Amino acid sequence: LALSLTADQMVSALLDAEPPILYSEYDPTRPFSSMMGLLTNLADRELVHMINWAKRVPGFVDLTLHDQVHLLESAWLEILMIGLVWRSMEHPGKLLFAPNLLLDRNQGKSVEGMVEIFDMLLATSSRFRMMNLQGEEFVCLKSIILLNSGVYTFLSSTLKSLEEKDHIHRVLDKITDTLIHLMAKAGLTLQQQHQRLAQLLLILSHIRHMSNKGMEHLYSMNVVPSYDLLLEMLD
Amino acid sequence: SLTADQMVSALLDAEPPILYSEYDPTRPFSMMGLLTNLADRELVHMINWAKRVPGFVDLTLHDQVHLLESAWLEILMIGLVWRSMEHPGKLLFAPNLLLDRNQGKSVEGMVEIFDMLLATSSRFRMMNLQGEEFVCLKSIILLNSGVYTFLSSTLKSLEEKDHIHRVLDKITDTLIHLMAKAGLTLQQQHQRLAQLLLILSHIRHMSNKGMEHLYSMKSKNVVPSYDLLLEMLDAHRLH
Numbered sequence: 001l002a003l004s005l006t007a008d009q010m011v012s013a014l015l016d017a018e019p020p021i022l023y024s025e026y027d028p029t030r031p032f033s034s035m036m037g038l039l040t041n042l043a044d045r046e047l048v049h050m051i052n053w054a055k056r057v058p059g060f061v062d063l064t065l066h067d068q069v070h071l072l073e074s075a076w077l078e079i080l081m082i083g084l085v086w087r088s089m090e091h092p093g094k095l096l097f098a099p100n101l102l103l104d105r106n107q108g109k110s111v112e113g114m115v116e117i118f119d120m121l122l123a124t125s126s127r128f129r130m131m132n133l134q135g136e137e138f139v140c141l142k143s144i145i146l147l148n149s150g151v152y153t154f155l156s157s158t159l160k161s162l163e164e165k166d167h168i169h170r171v172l173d174k175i176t177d178t179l180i181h182l183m184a185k186a187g188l189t190l191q192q193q194h195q196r197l198a199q200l201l202l203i204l205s206h207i208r209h210m211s212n213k214g215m216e217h218l219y220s221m222n223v224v225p226s227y228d229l230l231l232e233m234l235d
Numbered sequence: 236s237l238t239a240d241q242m243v244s245a246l247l248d249a250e251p252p253i254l255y256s257e258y259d260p261t262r263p264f265s266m267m268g269l270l271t272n273l274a275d276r277e278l279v280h281m282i283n284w285a286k287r288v289p290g291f292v293d294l295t296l297h298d299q300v301h302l303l304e305s306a307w308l309e310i311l312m313i314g315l316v317w318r319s320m321e322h323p324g325k326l327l328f329a330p331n332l333l334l335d336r337n338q339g340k341s342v343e344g345m346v347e348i349f350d351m352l353l354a355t356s357s358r359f360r361m362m363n364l365q366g367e368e369f370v371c372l373k374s375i376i377l378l379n380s381g382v383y384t385f386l387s388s389t390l391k392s393l394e395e396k397d398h399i400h401r402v403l404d405k406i407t408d409t410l411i412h413l414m415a416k417a418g419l420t421l422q423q424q425h426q427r428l429a430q431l432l433l434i435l436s437h438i439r440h441m442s443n444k445g446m447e448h449l450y451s452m453k454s455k456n457v458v459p460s461y462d463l464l465l466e467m468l469d470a471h472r473l474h
């Protein structure tokens with residue numbers, strides 16, 4: 001069923017699955033002063049919706065529950081970050097963590113080590129802006145992250161695991177076909193399609209890098225979702 | 236200006252040598268010392284290779300240093316994974332230093348990283364990665380890994396970033412040219428392109444884990460400094 005979709009059906013499926021944009025929970029009539037608490041509460045609530053989204057990525061629920069957990073455990077911070085960079089794209093110099101929580105780099109200075117991470121995310125959003133990234137390409141990229149980030153770290157060679165990895169790579173191939181279809185439908189030449197495909201996928205390496213830095217930042221001060229919590233939520 | 240075949244030839248011709256580990260092979264078999272000493276010597280040849288990547292020496296010295304500082308561990312790792320491709324279960328750090336995962340257990344925290352490198356090597360084997368594709372990917376890592384972290388918007392920096400992306404576009408054309416000449420269909424071409432580039436995200440992840448391991452081992456002194464990279468890159472032309 002998953003591998004059956006056309007490119008337009010894949011795009012429609014991914015667009016329909018998009019999670020909502022959440023708001024930060026602070027009293028807006030109360031003075032602003034808490035930063036780490038605001039950001040981690042927001043990511044808390046986003047995670048529940050991320051799982052709903054992931055279950056709607058075609059092919060994802062065809063995997064074992066264990067492999068769904070592994071994929072999400074590996075990708076969750078990358079997925080939060082690409083979403084942040086996407087909605088920050090039209091706010092140069094600012095990160096739209098939430099519509100009521102738009103921060104510039106000086107506001108990241110209030111937590112040691114955070115402005116460095118703010119700077120990388122702002123630069124990624126400028127790269128998105130520079131490339132005129134489209135919403136349809138964005139949902140493809142976010143789905144690629146979900147399927148790709150953990151696929152090389154199963155460290156299992158059971159027959160089931162071979163079939164799982166094969167399936168994941170088949171879905172990833174369909175998403176590649178879909179990105180190419182979208183750039184063809186936008187008028188790009190074949191050369192430009194291959195070049196833009198590459199430019200988009202290379203950005204995913206930097207998003208991986210930012211996630212690793214962000215994980216180190218977190219670890220340097222139970223904020224990380226445990227396997228068991230992810231398992232319970234995915235059930 | 237290069238054609239695809241000329242890009243391939245340039246990169247193949249620039250390949251660094253394969254170095255040996257320096258340990259007396261007639262003495263009993265230090266693990267971190269062996270691996271540190273090898274990477275230290277590979278770095279010098281990495282600089283030589285980088286200067287031969289088309290477009291690289293057209294950048295400012297500062298930007299050359301930034302790219303190498305950002306990419307150096309990824310470049311060592313992709314080389315290791317390529318060398319290990321035909322040795323299932325083993326990592327050929329050097330022809331005289333072929334280690335399995337149990338030998339990684341001697342350094343706390345190292346077997347986790349060995350497992351990731353072995354799985355990447357298995358992935359290369361499953362994709363039947365070719366030598367011409369490998370050199371393309373390694374050059375992409377050099378050009379891509381630090382291009383998003385210049386943290387500069389001077390006119391010169393905009394020109395540098397534009398140039399890097401033009402060279403990266405050229406390597407993309409070359410990868411597609413290689414798979415077209417291998418007979419792959421257009422659908423297969425963009426699928427293989429994507430599979431190869433997505434492996435570069437995992438190589439980035441492994442480098443982050445490896446840096447973190449180097450720092451936790453208190454082997455931070457082993458990371459090449461900005462000054463050291465600058466000193467080796469800022470060559471005179473008196474020789």
Ligand SMILES: CCCN(C)C(=O)CCCCCCCCCS[C@@H]1Cc2cc(O)ccc2[C@H]2CC[C@]3(C)[C@@H](O)CC[C@H]3[C@@H]21
Pocket residue numbers: 039040041042043044046047080081083084097114117214217218222223224225226
């Ligand atoms: C015991 C009771 C309390 N519990 C159980 C909890 O609170 C649950 C905690 C477990 C689930 C997830 C919490 C951690 C996620 C917080 S990331 C935090 C919020 C966030 C939201 C987004 O859209 C995009 C990115 C980010 C992050 C970008 C990288 C940052 C900037 C880092 O540099 C430091 C903060 C990071 C931000």
Ligand SMILES: CCCN(C)C(=O)CCCCCCCCCS[C@@H]1Cc2cc(O)ccc2[C@H]2CC[C@]3(C)[C@@H](O)CC[C@H]3[C@@H]21
Pocket residue numbers: 270271272273274275277278311312314315328345348445448449456457458459460462463
């Ligand atoms: C300070 C002032 C100026 N100076 C003097 C300097 O900067 C000196 C800096 C000289 C650079 C020396 C580099 C040492 C880096 C050692 S990587 C070490 C050797 C190596 C060689 C390869 O082919 C491929 C991968 C690796 C690595 C894969 C990840 C490992 C397994 C980690 O898990 C722990 C060891 C890592 C390995």
